Design a protein around this ligand. Structure first.
Ligand SMILES: Cc1ncc(COP(=O)(O)O)c(C=O)c1O
Ligand SMILES: Cc1ncc(COP(=O)(O)O)c(C=O)c1O
Lengths: 346, 346
């Protein structure tokens, strides 16, 4: 069941973790792997790479397994970094791209969001076109923290035009949650031979395995080979490898994982409509919504009430990112929000 | 319970893995983490960092947790690499240093082994002293593949002399197996404030957790801060983090892990002595010995008998590295070797 939270046992809706346990088949695989984990998972890593390759309709050399997509982002940046290069990003997006770009001494070119917190793709395209050196473009889709998608018919033709000296990193961490039919995975462009795309994926979100540390990149083999020089081989942990292989066969859990996230979303959105607090469309496992009280006060009052929400995401200073917990959790949070309103805490 | 091997179920003495399961307490920790691993192991990683800091008598900023020491070697090299830097290594050692040095575009300066396969420390010192640019020195102790130690009184005064523009990476993967009293961990030099040493350690060997991917670096905080820019945070897998925390408390297992290794070593050494095949002193969980037949023939005959031994380690072309299995495995291997001798296969 669900139990009312306290500060010692809070509802955790702070890091976009799946509030469900991983698949029972994946859990069995993970636990069974422990007795084997005195040894390296060498053959199993080969099997997982092959299975991911078939999933993306590419060959094995187009897959790089990494310890989460955290490592894929780093390797992608390191592989294509130089002191002449720029990273082109929307101003409000997932911070790892900029983090590793600054480590590489790159220019970071942030493009202001449009008036609906959408990506300004014309602005991103102009940031690349007017720069005479190499550009890395980092596109998170669906975006964190906003939750919104960028339509495929807006991204795909830009990428297909092959702007000179430009590598696109497309992070689809939250893609399996998506309901909007304008969203398409970029994967088929790689299957069809694109050499200017790195697709990053993870088992941390829909597969509910954040702590297991399994992600990967999909790209042309020449791109994967370059990225491979910035990781210490493919040496994923035994439990994560076996859990990943199992989760890939448990299509029933993946349907359930999406459906539970959909139910949670509507419970939150109901409360937000009742309170008349604007929110952005949610295509991941989180909602980004507006506040009329100071963010810091709201975070503190929620924390005292046993609920950990998202950190601040400047420059959206009056917005908060609320991850979607289980339905029972989101109802308790929705109702706390209603009680806050009565006393002006929201 | 021991059973005779087949080609489908071989004795695996090829990758210096501990042939013992992980500690029973560590396995239970690892299994119990799986239900929790929908979430990132954030606080648990902080606790493991603090526990390793206490173990090495340093503060937490002097520890960097990594996904095995493989990632530590990479990060250490990336942090200190430049196009003007050289890597100084013994000609016969663990190849990851050279590998990442080459990716960085560094000169790689290999110093021939002494006539007893020991490190030529005077040659390594001279290679640094002769080079006007920055140098990284990578010292594996006990060395892989030879298994030998370099006495502390030969290494410590070199490091303590602070050669200009030189960082020492000291890889003590196998150090808990060591019996030789001339061996000393470099750790106290970091506790005493050295800024030119990176110590790398792993849970993959004495702790028997190769497949759990947990290692770490110990260094001055300024050096750890630089290394940390080349990993995607400290985001170790949940089962590994909880297994590492438990294994650090199970001192009885560590004692047993070494003792079993010692027993296995003597079984192999007894066979080599009977066969009059020279070997090097073994201070890790493997033995480097000479062959009179071609290495490739010997590798093939052992594979066919269901025993997987080490790969070739040029330039020691007439030597093989045999990992130490359980005592019962090594008795069976030892007797297979005696039988091979009768038919000239060894
Ligand atoms: C867009 C995005 N990409 C990548 C990551 C990194 O996740 P992981 O290393 O668990 O795959 C996250 C954070 O969870 C994310 O939100
Ligand atoms: C000397 C040495 N250092 C480092 C490693 C890397 O091991 P891990 O990544 O499991 O810590 C090895 C394993 O082969 C090794 O032999």
């Amino acid at each position: 069941a669900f139990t009312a939270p306290s500060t010692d046992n809070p509802i955790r809706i702070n890091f976009n973790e799946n509030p469900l346990g991983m698949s029972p088949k994946a859990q069995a695989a993970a636990r069974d792997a422990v007795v084997k984990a005195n040894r390296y998972a060498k053959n199993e890593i080969l099997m997982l790479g092959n299975k991911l390759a078939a999933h993306h309709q590419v060959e094995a050399p187009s897959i790089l397994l990494t310890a989460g997509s955290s490592e894929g982002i780093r390797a992608a940046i390191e592989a294509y970094a130089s002191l002449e290069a720029q990273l082109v990003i929307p101003e409000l997006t997932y911070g790892d791209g900029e983090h590793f770009a600054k480590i590489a001494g790159m220019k970071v070119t942030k493009v202001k969001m449009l008036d609906n917190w959408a990506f300004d793709i014309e602005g991103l395209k102009a940031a690349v076109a007017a720069y005479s050196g190499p550009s890395i473009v980092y596109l998170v889709n669906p975006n964190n923290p906003t939750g919104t998608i960028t339509p495929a018919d807006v991204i795909e033709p830009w990428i297909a035009s092959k702007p000179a000296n430009t590598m696109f990193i497309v992070d689809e961490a939250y893609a399996e949650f998506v309901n909007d039919p304008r969203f398409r995975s970029i994967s088929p462009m790689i299957t069809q031979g694109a050499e200017n795309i790195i697709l990053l994926k993870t088992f941390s979100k829909i597969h509910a395995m954040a702590g297991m540390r399994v992600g990967y990149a999909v790209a042309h083999p020449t791109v994967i080979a370059l990225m491979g020089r910035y990781v210490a081989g493919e040496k994923i942990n035994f439990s994560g490898v076996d859990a990943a292989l199992a989760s890939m066969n448990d299509s029933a859990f993946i349907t359930y994982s999406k459906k539970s996230n959909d139910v949670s979303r509507q419970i939150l959105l109901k409360a937000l409509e009742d309170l008349k607090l604007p929110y952005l469309p949610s295509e991941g496992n989180f909602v980004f919504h507006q506040l009329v009280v100071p963010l810091k006060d709201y975070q503190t009052h929620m924390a005292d009430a046993g609920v950990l929400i998202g950190r601040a995401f400047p420059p959206a200073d009056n917005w908060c990112r609320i991850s979607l917990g289980t339905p029972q959790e989101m109802q308790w949070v929705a109702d706390t929000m209603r009680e806050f309103r009565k006393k002006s805490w929201i």
